[PDB]
DNA sequence: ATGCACAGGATGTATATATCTGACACGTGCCTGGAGACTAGGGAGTAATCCCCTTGGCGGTTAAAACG
DNA sequence: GTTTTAACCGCCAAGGGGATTACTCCCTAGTCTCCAGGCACGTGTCAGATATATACATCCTGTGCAT
């Protein structure tokens with residue numbers, strides 16, 4: 001149930017490296033977990049809202065696209 | 080109309096920073112502030128003049144400024160709506 | 161007489177008729193000017209040509225015959241005006257520009 | 268009468284040709300012992316002037332200041348109380 | 352027989368308190384209008400202006416400047432400093448997305 | 451006299467930075483991310499089915515946002531004359547971004 | 551059913567600029583998304599302009615103003631030139 | 644000519660909640676602009692919702708969905724409750 | 737004994753070449769959405785009016801800017 | 805703390821253009837008929853993936869020179 005711990009520290013380190021980060025404190029990982037969780041709630045709430053208004057039970061990628069678009073984060077390559 | 084950006088005197092920027100919660104201020108800040116303000120003003124006025132011209136008018140209204148600010152993601156209330 | 165595409169009359173590749181239909185059905189205004197879809201298709205075609213040229217250049221620099229999303233991301237981020245235009249646009253599998261801060265370099 | 272070639276500053280050529288960080292002192296002492304026979308006091312300056320770019324002469328900021336009625340102009344020209 | 356001068360910084364705090372409670376504009380109106388017209392000169396000549404427009408620009412600019420100053424103060428404090436550096440402003444604008 | 455070879459601290463980091471600033475593939479494991487997404491998608495509704503494309507789009511957007519936040523954090527830490535990021539840098543970055 | 555896109559037109563434009571360069575499906579999907587995004591941005595801005603001046607018709611002037619407002623500098627100038635040339639050619643034809 | 648606003652309704656609500664409180668003209672215009680902005684936000688979101696679902700009508704369900712999307716938490720819940728109550732009252736009467 | 741400057745073994749990275757595949761490009765039927773033709777009536781362009789609002793100037797005060 | 809200036813206020817005046825109104829007209833929405841452009845579908849290659857086997861390029865510590 002602790003899927004937030006499914007985000008292991010190697011993945012966080014890899015993301016930091018792609019972000020150009022060289023030295024990382026040990027307290028960083030949990031902070032990233034929390035921030036990512038907040039972002040996920042913000043997106044998923046709107047995605048579920050769109051899914052429900054369409055009277056559907058399966059979330060479509062277009063729902064996620066709309067949710068991201070209305071949050072100011074436009075995504076291409078999915079429709 | 081030349082050399083008006085110097086019209087923003089150092090005490091004015093000082094007051095702006097004091098309202099911004101700044102306690103100690105470097106001396107080589109004011110010109111940077113003036114440049115940034117000039118950039119912002121240019122960006123707004125460009126779109127304001129574009130709106131005014133599309134309406135084939137010769138005076139710029141506040142309402143044009145409202146649209147220009149809205150399009151730049153800076154909404155302002157109390158100037159016509 | 162024989163049907164002639166409005167794109168051919170304007171010398172464009174983008175479908176002006178489809179653009180006009182979408183403008184009509186897009187609930188933007190009650191009436192649509194006749195010269196509107198031509199203008200819009202021309203602007204779209206110009207932007208498409210610009211970014212396709214940059215992406216093809218990037219793909220050639222990678223010695224690849226097909227443009228990939230990485231090429232598109234590189235072209236967009238490298239072009240200042242294009243990057244500013246797509247400032248808030250995220251490209252899937254586009255990666256990032258290779259950039260490392262100076263202070264992190266070995267000295 | 269253009270030189271029509273790779274031109275470098277006196278400092279630029281000194282830093283691009285004789286740039287021996289370990290053996291600069293060797294050249295310094297070589298020049299010092301070369302001039303030691305006649306002029307040892309001026310050997311260091313005679314070596315160092317070759318390491319500097321050409322310059323325009325200027326008073327050393329204290330010949331000027333002993334006279335309060337003298338000020339330096341825009342391009343280094345001499346100015347006095349009769350400038351307006 | 353002493354000048355009785357306040358220590359460096361308490362006056363700054365007092366004026367911070369003064370200007371964080373007021374709402375009026377802090378910039379002289381005439382220079383701002385002159386600068387605005389000078390900038391607009393480069394886009395179209397013989398342009399007239401409603402006064403409400405110039406007030407709108409002044410309000411928007413002062414609000415944006417106050418926000419930028421507040422962000423710059425946080426940036427400088429993050430550097431464990433007390434005085435504002437232009438590098439703080441540059442970093443703040445870059446983080447905002449303006450650079 | 452036998453010594454084992456090992457690079458100095460900060461070398462493998464730069465090598466990894468070069469490696470991952472070149473590639474574009476996703477960095478997070480698929481199954482843990484999917485399980486986290488499904489768990490999160492329970493306090494709004496129950497029995498939610500998911501198109502795979504939605505999950506992958508979520509992963510793409512999340513990774514891009516995280517990378518951008520990491521880069522901002524790196525700039526913030528560098529501004530503090532440091533090479534190590536600690537969570538106060540993340541907090542300042544999100545605060546200036548307006549997220550806070 | 552059948553879904554329309556911009557694949558053929560983007561392909562033709564590519565063959566005009568790079569008559570030998572291929573393309574992947576993900577790339578042209580991104581292409582179509584970008585085209586739709588630009589279309590919606592310009593059309594929405596034009597509708598906003600038309601409502602601003604109390605007019606029921608969207609003309610090419612509205613699109614010109616919208617492009618000037620949305621595109622930065624040289625891109626805007628070049629796009630204005632392209633639109634003007636295409637309009638003049640179509641009207642003359 | 645004549646321009647309309649929400650001034651009278653705002654004043655009515657002000658007297659409803661704070662019967663002994665006045666209001667300045669500038670503040671009054673601020674509320675007018677605020678109401679206009681909220682109107683535009685809800686209307687645009689509802690229009691996008693309708694277009695996404697391929698629908699010809701803007702119903703109260705779309706309004707509720709837009710309210711949920713654009714309002715934070717408790718504001719959204721209370722606004723949904725108020726809208727549902729008003730709709731029920733109007734339908735009954 | 738200390739700062740520099742090579743030699744070299746370790747190591748991970750880039751190149752070269754061979755093979756196989758599925759992903760892209762191409763060929764085809766069809767059909768529906770665009771094109772051609774025609775109308776009317778209303779949105780838009782045009783002309784005349786005015787008066788308000790924008791600009792501009794001049795004199796006096798002083799608060800605010802400048803300066804050390 | 806001391807000195808200077810121009811922002812600001814008031815007061816006035818002239819006129820430009822933005823709003824207004826009436827008239828007209830041609831352009832686009834609406835309708836019908838017709839046909840081919842684009843799209844769904846099916847095949848066939850070859851760009852690039854993949855695997856393996858070599859040149860590089862650095863990293864890094866151990867040499868000397870000598871100050």
Ligand SMILES: [Zn+2]
Pocket residue numbers: 275276277278279280
């Ligand atoms: Zn030189």
